[PDB]
Amino acid sequence: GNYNYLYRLFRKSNLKPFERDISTEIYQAGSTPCNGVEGFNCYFPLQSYG
Amino acid sequence: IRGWIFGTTLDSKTQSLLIVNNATNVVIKVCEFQFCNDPFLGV
């Protein structure tokens, strides 16, 4: 499995045309704020292709 | 006045356009620059 190609899975808003987002900030998907640390309702925004 | 910084956080976490005009050389970069707490250029 080639896991070098990634894609963004979570983002607070949709990209404008020809916009490039490479930030790896932990996505806050719940009410509890994330302090940059992965966990419950706190996602790493990039997922790896199979 | 010799330059401009454009971005969202200006703290090396995102890409920020940096334009500097030093004497006769216009320099444009879009690197993820690590800027000082109070950016300035000395003489």
Ligand SMILES: *[C@@H]1O[C@H](CO)[C@@H](O[C@@H]2O[C@H](CO)[C@@H](O)[C@H](O)[C@H]2NC(C)=O)[C@H](O)[C@H]1NC(C)=O
């Ligand atoms: C461009 O960056 C700004 C922040 O620098 C984004 O504004 C944020 O938008 C979200 C909602 O999607 C808010 O919850 C944040 O509080 C906003 N940030 C600030 C500092 O107000 C803006 O959405 C970004 N543009 C795109 C297209 O993602």
Ligand SMILES: *[C@@H]1O[C@H](CO)[C@@H](O)[C@H](O)[C@H]1NC(C)=O
């Ligand atoms: C202006 O800065 C650039 C790099 O930022 C450098 O390559 C260039 O030589 C500088 N120009 C002068 C006149 O010092």
